[PDB]
Design a protein around this ligand. Structure first.
Ligand SMILES: Nc1ncnc2c1ncn2[C@@H]1O[C@H](CSCC[C@H](N)C(=O)O)[C@@H](O)[C@H]1O
Ligand SMILES: Nc1ncnc2c1ncn2[C@@H]1O[C@H](CSCC[C@H](N)C(=O)O)[C@@H](O)[C@H]1O
Ligand SMILES: [Zn+2]
Ligand SMILES: [Zn+2]
Lengths: 350, 350
């Protein structure tokens, strides 16, 4: 139940601040996330590593987490800083997690989350709605020193709607205004448009590019404060930083592995067993989906041990026939689950 | 959506009214129930076959169904009599179905169920509680001409608690009393104690022994009316009637087979495909449970075609090694699902 002891199940995070390409089809950023089931985002972004000096400078007693889904990012934060309380908000709908199901799993209980948002309307859970930020202090009367946002907006221009609303709150809140300009919002951002100017009095301190970010996108985490408005990054800038990481850096695997989680993800993709190789250095009964799953994992089993980097991952994709049959027959949720189980196999090899 | 056309998915019911034994381990009474998923009871008992002449004599416009789980018995009744409305009650708890999920499936909608019991307490859903029978006319102001009970009471002596309560209602109900003694309760009964006398003024018209009843039990359906109280059956009497059926009679299979249901039950026991035999007259990747499932179904595939009766079923059990490994490794819900899929395979053979 000790928070600092649970961090051993979390992997070492590599990031970068602000002609060789890989061409892969699988979400390989999920290799070192085998120890997690409902949410996975806690493995790509970490507060102690990315904005650790900022957490020292302004010691927040309460952290405000918006658009947090299953709460894995919040969960790692609970392990990294075992004396910090949390305020949780995530969009209330059928399609996504609106309860910290992963936090509850790795931490044990919701005691440290003083306000989980239990008993709130669809409107008061949406970061793009004024009433959400109005009811943010409904329990915690602590200022929004550091506000974390990981919301995956359907129309990406909703990012701005919540940025303006964050600004509007910190500049019109009895609690927050007593801290001045030294208030930060660490939000996930996709570069839909190049060199876009931030709303009035919103400044980008730093742009963070994650190793655990999907290689094909333009996803980055930007530290926002109150100050003279500047331009946001662009697809190009992020893409070269993302690519530079993939070549040089290798994916770090969690020091300790949670067997209960490994087995959870296994049962989750398909109800069938994983095998250790006997090397010591018909399948007609399964459905088309169940076969493609086992056949990929068989290829991983038969494949030798290699460094956990996009060089070796590209090789595993190029050494497998029916790669396109695979990506078509398995949904985005299944392929992500697949890589968690694949990464475990690759870590447990030799 | 036509009720009479949906009866083709229901199997022909064989029953009996009131030294050779089989020794089987699997619930074979589930062979002809491949077309059903949430509930299965509709295949062992039918009103048009068992008490068809009684439904003619007193034409009920509304039928009262208590302890009905997923509502498959009610569903077959809807097909057998396409102009009858229903009142539904089943115990409200987490462990069992308290909504007619199977009726909704085979019929399409809950339009014919005038009172599904939606918005009732745990107490008003329990047949052993006075308030249940008090709120029975909360919608339907039609007398309890024929009341059907299939409740699977934890302590079997709760059967009497509801029988006395049924009596107490029909003899103290403004609506019901206007019909006199000619009121019937068709209830499931287990012979816990031999020759037990029914409560005062409750008479057993007939005792019904089903082919689709579990061979090892003492389950029977007894038609109860208001009259001089008589004795209930006993384990012995039922057992010889149950055995007499198993020897002579063969299980009738549904004329038409619902592919959507067959596939539902398949996915339900394990997420893997069923194969047609190519005769034209490693498995290390699966878990211990998934293997025992496939290995049994492989034995059924390799086995020749035979009559759907306990003679052939005993033979299939005696021709299979690890029969005890099977019954231990698979729960009562899984083995029941297994036989539904087994029966489909046996029906689809040659
Ligand atoms: N407009 C909006 N306002 C608030 N939350 C939103 C939103 N649009 C999407 N979301 C939330 O954003 C989430 C993206 S996933 C968040 C994962 C999280 N960082 C973790 O590690 O657990 C979704 O689950 C959804 O509930
Ligand atoms: N005391 C009680 N009062 C009412 N219902 C009860 C009960 N004890 C058990 N039950 C119900 O009895 C059901 C037995 S299964 C009923 C299946 C039904 N004939 C069909 O074909 O769909 C359980 O689902 C449970 O909800
Ligand atoms: Zn505030
Ligand atoms: Zn009445």
């Amino acid at each position: 139940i000790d928070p600092t002891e649970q961090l051993a199940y979390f992997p070492k995070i590599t990031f970068e601040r602000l002609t060789r390409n890989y061409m892969i089809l699988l979400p390989w950023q999920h290799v070192n996330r085998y120890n997690f089931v409902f949410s996975s985002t806690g493995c790509k972004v970490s507060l102690k590593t990315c904005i650790g000096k900022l957490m020292k400078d302004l010691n927040p007693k309460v952290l405000y987490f918006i658009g947090e889904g299953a709460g894995n990012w919040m969960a790692r934060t609970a392990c990294e800083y075992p004396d910090i309380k949390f305020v949780y908000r995530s969009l209330k709908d059928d399609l996504d997690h609106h309860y910290p199901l992963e936090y509850q799993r790795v931490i044990g209980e919701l005691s440290r989350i003083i306000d989980s948002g239990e008993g709130l309307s669809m409107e008061t859970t949406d970061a793009t709605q004024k009433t959400h930020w109005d009811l943010i202090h409904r329990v915690s009367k602590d200022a929004l020193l550091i506000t974390l946002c990981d919301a995956e907006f359907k129309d990406r221009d909703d990012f701005f709607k919540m940025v303006i609303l964050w600004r509007k709150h910190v500049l019109s809140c009895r609690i927050c205004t007593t801290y001045g300009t030294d208030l930060y919002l660490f939000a996930k951002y996709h570069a839909k448009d190049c060199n876009v100017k931030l709303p009035f009095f919103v400044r980008s301190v730093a742009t963070f590019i994650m190793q655990g970010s999907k290689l094909s996108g333009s996803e980055c985490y930007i530290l926002l404060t109150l100050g003279h408005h500047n331009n946001l990054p662009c697809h190009g800038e992020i893409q070269n930083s993302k690519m530079k990481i993939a070549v040089a850096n290798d994916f770090y695997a969690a020091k300790k592995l949670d067997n209960k989680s490994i087995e959870a993800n296994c049962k989750s993709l398909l109800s069938g067993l994983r095998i250790p190789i006997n090397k010591k250095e018909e399948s007609k009964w399964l459905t088309n989906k169940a076969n493609t799953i086992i056949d990929w994992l068989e290829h991983i089993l038969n494949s030798p041990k290699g460094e956990l980097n996009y060089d070796f991952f590209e090789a595993l994709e190029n050494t497998y026939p029916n790669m396109i049959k695979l990506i078509d027959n398995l949904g985005n949720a299944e392929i992500k689950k697949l890589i968690k189980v694949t990464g475990y196999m690759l870590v447990s090899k030799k």
